[PDB]
Amino acid sequence: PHIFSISDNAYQYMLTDRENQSILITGESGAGKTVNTKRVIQYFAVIAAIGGTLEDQIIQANPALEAFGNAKTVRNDNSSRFGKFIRIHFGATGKLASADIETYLLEKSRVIFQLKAERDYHIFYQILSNKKPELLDMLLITNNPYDYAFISQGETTVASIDDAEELMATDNAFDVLGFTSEEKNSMY
Amino acid sequence: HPRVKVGNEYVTKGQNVQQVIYATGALAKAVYERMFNWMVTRINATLETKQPRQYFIGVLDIAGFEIFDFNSFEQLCINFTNEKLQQFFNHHMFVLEQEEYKKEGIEWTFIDFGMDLQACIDLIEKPMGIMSILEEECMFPKATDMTFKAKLFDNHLGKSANFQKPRNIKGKPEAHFSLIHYAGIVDYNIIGWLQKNKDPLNETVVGLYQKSSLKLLSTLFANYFQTVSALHRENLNKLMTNLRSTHPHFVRCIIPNETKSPGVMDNPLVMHQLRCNGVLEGIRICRKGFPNRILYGDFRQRYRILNPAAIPEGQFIDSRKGAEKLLSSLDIDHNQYKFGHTKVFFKAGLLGLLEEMRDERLSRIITRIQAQSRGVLARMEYKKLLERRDSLLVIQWNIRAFMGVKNWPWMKLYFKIKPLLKSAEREKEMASMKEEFTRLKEALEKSEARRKELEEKMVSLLQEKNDLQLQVQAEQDNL
Amino acid sequence: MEYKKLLERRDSLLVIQWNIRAFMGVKNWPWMKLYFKIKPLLKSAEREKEMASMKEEFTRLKEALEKSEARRKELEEKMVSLLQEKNDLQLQVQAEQDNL
Amino acid sequence: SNVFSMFDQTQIQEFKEAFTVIDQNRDGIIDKEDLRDTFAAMGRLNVKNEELDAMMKEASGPINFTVFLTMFGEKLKGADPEDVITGAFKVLDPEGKGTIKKQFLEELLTTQCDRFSQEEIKNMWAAFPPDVGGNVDYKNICYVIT
Amino acid sequence: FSMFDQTQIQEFKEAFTVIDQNRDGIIDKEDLRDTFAAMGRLNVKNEELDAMMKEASGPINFTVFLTMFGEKLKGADPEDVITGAFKVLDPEGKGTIKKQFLEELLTTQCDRFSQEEIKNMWAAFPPDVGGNVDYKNICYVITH
Amino acid sequence: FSKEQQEDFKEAFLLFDRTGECKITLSQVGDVLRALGTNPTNAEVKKVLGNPSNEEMNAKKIEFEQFLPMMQAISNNKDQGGYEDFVEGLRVFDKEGNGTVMGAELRHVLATLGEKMKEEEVEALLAGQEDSNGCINYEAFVKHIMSV
Ligand SMILES: Nc1ncnc2c1ncn2[C@@H]1O[C@H](COP(=O)(O)OP(=O)(O)O)[C@@H](O)[C@H]1O
Ligand SMILES: CC(C)n1c(=O)cc(N[C@@H](C)c2ccccc2)[nH]c1=O
Ligand SMILES: [Mg+2]
Ligand SMILES: [Mg+2]
Ligand SMILES: [Mg+2]
């Protein structure tokens, strides 16, 4: 038993019945739905990798949306705050063809308000806690998170996240997804 | 001083310090949320290698269930959106699968697993649900969170099995309600919800955003009844309608323990999760039911290989009657299969046994066939390596000729005169003539084929597009 | 813009002047003056006429074929996108019935 | 210098056939009596001593095979413009009429290109007498250049 | 003669008949002087022109011309087949492989010649930014 | 300027002179110096000439050797405006603030309000540069006209 067995089963029923399939990852928060999704996507990515631009893009489409989507909560250090549905499209020859990300609602309220023991969205602190001064000064923001009232309330340092690298990761996720530098800078 | 319209002229209203703070919050939220949805729309604008599509596999992670000590509008949205996905599990495994058995006329008795929560999704989704209230209430400029709380309690208390009054044992009884989403309690704080649902933006300020020098901020606000509740709802209803056109496999991820202690596994939390995910019922129905069915035409043709004397080629064979003879010939336990109108039915023991017998019978025949295919693949590829070796050989020979010629003093005649001479005048002419005529023939036939087929397909789809467009017009009229 | 357009156009006019100057240069009497102007020569006039006629046909069709191939691709791309839109619209009519 | 024109342009080695395969002796050279078949190649004119003056002016007679071929390579230089000329005419007038007046361009190039004298303007007027249409046909000109 | 394609034989006949500038039927020093001055450039003033006669002193006919070129033609093959062979050799069929792949394979698979001649040609251009062996240019530089 | 600069300046006059060697265009020469060097206000050209008559502007042709110093003098008037200086200009005509200028009032401004311009040039300079709504991306128009 493994999640990779379910992904292979869905690819087999696809090729045999000639019908669309789905893999419906579910549970409580903190169980692994985002990582299992990243693994199912890794399944199709590496399967098409032995037999790539879309292959990589579908994997990175999770963490780039996570860094904006997601905030450390009391229930998980990396709990996402938006619903996502992916379609992975395959051609007749069974190779990877296209993908389609539909997202249902971002927790927009979090951007200005956090309870004790929970962060604002990770993009905020990882731009503040920064290895790159240029991001810190182009925003002309202070390196200390605490003075900005809306993000600073709640809790802003976490036991398990290297925000310097999570910033590096989100930067790389937009690099591979091909967001232009002007778009990436404008959204920061 | 936001500008509001009164007739054709705009009037100016002075804002309070608290309400300008709230408006700056709303501007921060709506710029963030639009920036996120635009980032998704740009992801969906890449992720497209423009290749023709025939099958998709939809992978869903639509929320973690969550309890915090403080839950708000999106903690309702996230818990609800998962709630629908688990009710989809209930419907697919226990309704959709079990109804098919009775429809096919199998001697099967429908068993009620009792796993249903459709009352609580209807509690949210229905035009009388919580999200329906928050959308009907947020239109009124004179609405307030406290009356929203009154009407919200009045409509559901004593009318929904999942809606109950809160206890507020930990205090804070200012304005609370609790909703028992599938995986347990979640308590909610009603404060601020209406402003969050409407998200009213100061129209002068967004009009200035539209007017911004920053191309993104204009693109975000270009083209700024349709509340956040309603838009989310319609996306999630699209989700289920898009998903019912797929064959689903479910994955139940279980949290073991609160404290992140790895390798530790708290039995009460995991077992309660298996209880709420209804997994033991999925075991019961997979063991008792029939996990796999194949169309008579597809399987008779696929596994006739098990006994070609039962299904001889050329001779007429009925798929149902042939399937009856073949399966009787396998000598398997006759209680492990059933006959449907258009699908054959197998237990999991028989399915697995037929699967393996098909794999072995195919292995004995097709491995011989594959041995021949490996024969032809290796032979042809290594012949290509022999041809590429031969080309390498004539390359190194001509390179040796090339050195022999340029070091040769006579090369002055050889190099310059032959481009001038008749061979470059005529052999190149013949080469271009045959190249052009061959490309002419192939390009002409391929383009005519494609156009003739594709124009009639396009017009057929465009007519269907206009018919459904008229249907949409009828919808927009009724709405 | 005016300056550059005038210079390039007058330079082309200088090429046109070289063309006519060349003809007066050619109004000298060589053996070729008789044979080139009138058409009796087989390989030079006839085979170049074959080169020009065949190339004329090939290149005209080359254009037609490349633009046609593109137009067929464009329709394919339109049918692929319409196929997605027709399926999403089929789902959307069920969604709209739910709106009703 | 003069031998380089034969090397720069192309479609000229083919003209050597207009020597090689129109020669009456098929031996390799223009003899002092090839005029006998030039009169037949034209058809409407006959023997004249001026053809001998041609044979003496254009060539030294049978001494060197290449001097005939390089004389034709000397004439070759004209072939370069047709690549540019079509564009030059489209940029001159893109609408299509191309009604460039004869006495208009006759006074244009004198002002635009170099200083044309009486023998040069004699050659320019002889190049195209003003037709009753009053415009130089760009197509007739290109076919003339052809 | 069976080794030669008749095209090259006729081309050798065309070259031999055009090279005999004085209708000599044979080649001499003065013919070489006019050939180099007309075909080449004034830089041919070097004594090396006298060394060219040392290679084949005395009159030589088309038969010996063909036999001398034929033995000199060892390792040479008709261009049309070499074009086809190069198009088959390329995996992509269009001249875009990198030099390091081809030089490693040619030296490994057969006939370990000196590496330096193939390396100097293929590294005459940087293989990381210009490694594309556009074989038409290679075959023509060998010949045309 | 370099001695090789004046030669290529000279042949501009040599193409524009329709005379075989006594013309340079008193009415059109300053207009061409914009292309070879920097561009002045025409009034400054008139001030270096010393305010001649309009009939002089239509009938007179001047002598080139006296004009070589004029090349430098017309080049001399520094404090020409920069990119930001120009881009803040058309914003005062922009009554929207978003970065577009409607061509119905843009051509009006360029024709009616500043120095005189030959109107056909005003028609053809913006031709092809418009958008479908009938406006101009003037920060592009300025970075167009400053560069090329
Ligand atoms: N199977 C697993 N292997 C490794 N880490 C896991 C696994 N499941 C969950 N985690 C960890 O638990 C946290 C939550 O995982 P995630 O996939 O984000 O689930 P959720 O989205 O429900 O929070 C992360 O820190 C992740 O590394
Ligand atoms: C109706 C549903 C539960 N179902 C089946 O009951 C059987 C399916 N497929 C058969 C044909 C199969 C068996 C083994 C490998 C591939 C496909 N698909 C299915 O989707
Ligand atoms: Mg998650
Ligand atoms: Mg003769
Ligand atoms: Mg000799």
In degrees and rounded to multiples of 5, residue B344 shows phi and psi of -85, 150
By DSSP bridging, strand F101-102 and strand B247-253 are unpaired
Which tokens belong to E127? 């293989």
Which tokens belong to E50? 């006298």
Cα B40 from Cα B42, distance rounded (Å)? 5
Broken C–N links (> 2.5 Å) in chain C, after residues: none
DSSP code per residue over chain C: -HHHHHHHHHHHHHHHHHHHHHHHHH-S--HHHHHHHSS--IIIIIHHHHHHHHHHHHHHHHHHHHHHHHHHHHHHHHHHHHHHHHHHHHHHHHHHHHH-
Q: Which among C22, C31, C44 has CB closest to D14?
A: C44
Count Cα neighbours of B352 within 13 Å in the Cβ-side half-sphere. 5
DSSP code per residue over D92-146: H-SSS----BHHHHHHHHHHHSS---HHHHHHHHHH-PPPTT-B--HHHHHHHH-
Name the residue of chain B whose CA is nearest to C62's CA. B440
Closest among E15, F130, F31 to B420, alpha carbons compared: E15
**CB neighbours (10 Å) of residue D110?**
18
Distance E58 CA to ligand 5 centre (A): 12
Residues 7 to 36 of F: which have CB under 8 A from any D CB? Answer: 15, 18, 20
Sheet strand arrangement including B163-164: B163-164, B176-179, B186-189
Amino acid at B177: F
Name the residue of chain B whose CA is nearest to A184's CA. B39
- CB environment B140-155: b (16+ within 10 A), e (fewer): eeebebeebbeebeeb
CA–CA distances in Å: residue B409 to residues B278, E12, E54, E120: 90, 18, 11, 21
CB neighbours of B397 closer than 8 A, spacing ≥ 6?
Answer: E75, E76, E77
DSSP code per residue over B433-465: HHHHHHHHHHHHHHHHHHHHHHHHHHHHHHHHH
Cα D68 from Cα D66, distance rounded (Å)? 5
- The torsion defined by the Cα of A126, A132, A134 and A137, in degrees rounded to 10, comes to 50
Cα E60 from Cα E57, distance rounded (Å)? 8
Q: From the CA of D68, which ligand is nearest? A: 4
In terms of Cβ atoms closer than 10 Å to its own Cβ (0-12, 13-18, 19+), residue F71 is buried
- The torsion defined by the Cα of C15, C20, C24 and C26, in degrees rounded to 10, comes to 70
| Residue D53 annotated as lining a ligand binding site | no
| Min distance D14 CA to chain F CA atoms (Å) | 40
| Residue A52 annotated as lining a ligand binding site | no
**CB neighbours (10 Å) of residue C65?**
18
Closest among D11, D134, D143 to D77, alpha carbons compared: D11
Cα B305 from Cα B303, distance rounded (Å)? 5
In terms of Cβ atoms closer than 10 Å to its own Cβ (0-12, 13-18, 19+), residue B449 is exposed
Name the residue of chain E whose CA is nearest to B425's CA. E11
In degrees and rounded to multiples of 5, residue B293 shows phi and psi of -140, 140
Cα A89 from Cα C84, distance rounded (Å)? 12
Which tokens belong to B29? 């939220």
- The torsion defined by the Cα of B27, B33, B35 and B39, in degrees rounded to 10, comes to 180
CA–CA distances in Å: residue B248 to residues A10, A23, A95: 8, 6, 20
Cα F87 from Cα A65, distance rounded (Å)? 38
Secondary structure of chain D: what % helix, strand, coil (to 5)? 60, 0, 40
Closest among A18, C82, C68 to B457, alpha carbons compared: C82
Q: Which chains are adjacent to chain B, needing at least 3 Cβ pairs under 8 Å? A: A, C, D, E, F
In degrees and rounded to multiples of 5, residue B176 shows phi and psi of -125, 150
| Residue D25 annotated as lining a ligand binding site | yes
Distance D29 CA to ligand 4 centre (A): 6
Verify C-D touch: 3 or more CB pairs within 8 A: yes
Residues in chain B: 479
Cα B197 from Cα B133, distance rounded (Å)? 11
Which tokens belong to B35? 């920036």
By DSSP bridging, strand B343-346 and strand A21-27 are unpaired
Distance B71 CA to ligand 1 centre (A): 22
Q: From the CA of A37, which ligand is nearest? A: 1
State the closest ligand 2 atom to the C-alpha of B343, by its place in the atom list counted from 1. 6
Counts of helices then strands in chain A (DSSP H, E): 8, 3
Verify F-A touch: 3 or more CB pairs within 8 A: no
Q: Whose CA is nearest to atom 5 of ligand 1?
A: A32
Yes or no, beta carbons of F18 and D111 under 8 Å apart: yes
In degrees and rounded to multiples of 5, residue B138 shows phi and psi of -70, -5
State the closest ligand 2 atom to the C-alpha of B292, by its place in the atom list counted from 1. 6
Query: Beta strands of B152-272 (E only): which ranges?
Result: 163-164, 176-179, 186-189, 247-253
Inter-residue contact A170 to A64 (CB < 8 Å)? yes
- CB environment A111-137: b (16+ within 10 A), e (fewer): bbbbbeebbbbbbbbbbbbbeeeebbe
Cα B135 from Cα A120, distance rounded (Å)? 27
Cα B348 from Cα B341, distance rounded (Å)? 20
Q: What SS3 state is found at B367?
A: helix
Yes or no, beta carbons of C80 and B53 under 8 Å apart: yes
Tell me whether D115 touches chain F (CB under 8 Å).
yes
Amino acid at A128: L
**CB neighbours (10 Å) of residue F9?**
19
Rg (CA), chain E: 20
Quick check: CB of B247 below 6 Å from ligand 2? yes
Tell me whether D111 touches chain F (CB under 8 Å).
yes
Quick check: CB of B293 below 6 Å from ligand 2? yes
Q: 3-state secondary structure string, E4-71?
A: CCHHHHHHHHHHHHHHCCCCCCCCCHHHHHHHHHHHCCHHHHCCHHHHHHHHCCCCCCHHHHHHHHHH
Residue F136, Ramachandran bin (φ over 0: left; ψ between -120 and 50: alpha; else beta): beta
Inter-residue contact B290 to B312 (CB < 8 Å)? no
Q: What SS3 state is found at B6?
A: strand
Count Cα neighbours of F47 within 13 Å in the Cβ-side half-sphere. 8
Which tokens belong to C98? 């739910």
Which tokens belong to B455? 């124009």
Amino acid at B181: H
Which tokens belong to B226? 């349709």
Inter-residue contact C40 to D17 (CB < 8 Å)? no
Which tokens belong to B56? 């998709």
Amino acid at E53: M
Distance D51 CA to ligand 3 centre (A): 99
Name beta bridge partners: A108. none
Chain E residues whose beta carbon lies within 8 Å of the beta carbon of residue B421: 11, 14-15
Q: Which chains are adjacent to chain F, needing at least 3 Cβ pairs under 8 Å? A: B, C, D
State the closest ligand 2 atom to the C-alpha of B295, by its place in the atom list counted from 1. 11
Verify F-E touch: 3 or more CB pairs within 8 A: no
Chain C residues whose beta carbon lies within 8 Å of the beta carbon of residue F32: 3
| Min distance D102 CA to chain E CA atoms (Å) | 42
User: What single DSSP character describes residue B93?
Assistant: I
Counts of helices then strands in chain F (DSSP H, E): 9, 2
Count Cα neighbours of C91 within 13 Å in the Cβ-side half-sphere. 18
In terms of Cβ atoms closer than 10 Å to its own Cβ (0-12, 13-18, 19+), residue E9 is middle
CA–CA distances in Å: residue A102 to residues A21, A41, B62: 17, 15, 10
Amino acid at E45: K
- Cα E105 from chain centroid? 24
DSSP code per residue over B295-340: EHHHHHHHHGGG-TTTS-SSS---HHHHHHHHHHHT---GGGEEE-
CA–CA distances in Å: residue B14 to residues B2, B11, B30, D55, F20: 7, 10, 22, 105, 77
Cα B14 from Cα B9, distance rounded (Å)? 17
User: What single DSSP character describes residue B408?
Assistant: S
Amino acid at B341: H
Which tokens belong to B288? 């008792």
Quick check: CB of A31 below 6 Å from ligand 1? yes
Cα E65 from Cα E58, distance rounded (Å)? 12
Inter-residue contact B290 to B350 (CB < 8 Å)? no
Q: Which chains are adjacent to chain A, needing at least 3 Cβ pairs under 8 Å? A: B
Q: What SS3 state is found at E119?
A: helix
Quick check: CB of A7 below 6 Å from ligand 1? no
Distance B345 CA to ligand 1 centre (A): 39
CA–CA distances in Å: residue B430 to residues B126, E77, E85, E86, E88: 77, 19, 19, 20, 21
Name beta bridge partners: B294. B344
User: What single DSSP character describes residue D25?
Assistant: S
By DSSP bridging, strand B176-179 and strand B186-189 are antiparallel
Cα B198 from Cα F145, distance rounded (Å)? 47
Closest among E30, E143, E50, E136 to E93, alpha carbons compared: E136
Cα B251 from Cα B255, distance rounded (Å)? 13
Counts of helices then strands in chain E (DSSP H, E): 9, 0
Max Cα–Cα distance, chain A, nearest Å = 59
Quick check: CB of A142 below 6 Å from ligand 1? no
Resolution in A: 3.7
Yes or no, beta carbons of C68 and B451 under 8 Å apart: yes
Quick check: CB of A79 below 6 Å from ligand 1? yes
Cα A128 from Cα A136, distance rounded (Å)? 6
Closest among B188, B194, B75, B232 to A107, alpha carbons compared: B75
Name beta bridge partners: B250. A24
State the closest ligand 1 atom to the C-alpha of A27, by its place in the atom list counted from 1. 22
Tell me whether B440 touches chain C (CB under 8 Å).
yes
Secondary structure of chain F: what % helix, strand, coil (to 5)? 55, 5, 40
Cα A93 from Cα B54, distance rounded (Å)? 10
Q: What SS3 state is found at A151?
A: helix
- Cα A160 from chain centroid? 17
CA–CA distances in Å: residue B189 to residues A111, B146, B176, B301: 18, 12, 5, 61
Which tokens belong to A54? 């879309």
Quick check: CB of B292 below 6 Å from ligand 2? yes
- Cα E18 from chain centroid? 20
- Cα B327 from chain centroid? 37
Residues 5 to 24 of C: which have CB under 8 A from any F CB? Answer: 6-7, 10
Which tokens belong to A115? 């309870």
Inter-residue contact B188 to B149 (CB < 8 Å)? no
User: What single DSSP character describes residue A145?
Assistant: G
Q: At what angle do helices F64-75 and F29-36 cross, to 10 degrees?
A: 50
Q: From the CA of A27, which ligand is nearest? A: 1
- Cα D53 from chain centroid? 19
Tell me whether B219 touches chain F (CB under 8 Å).
no
Cα B165 from Cα B158, distance rounded (Å)? 9
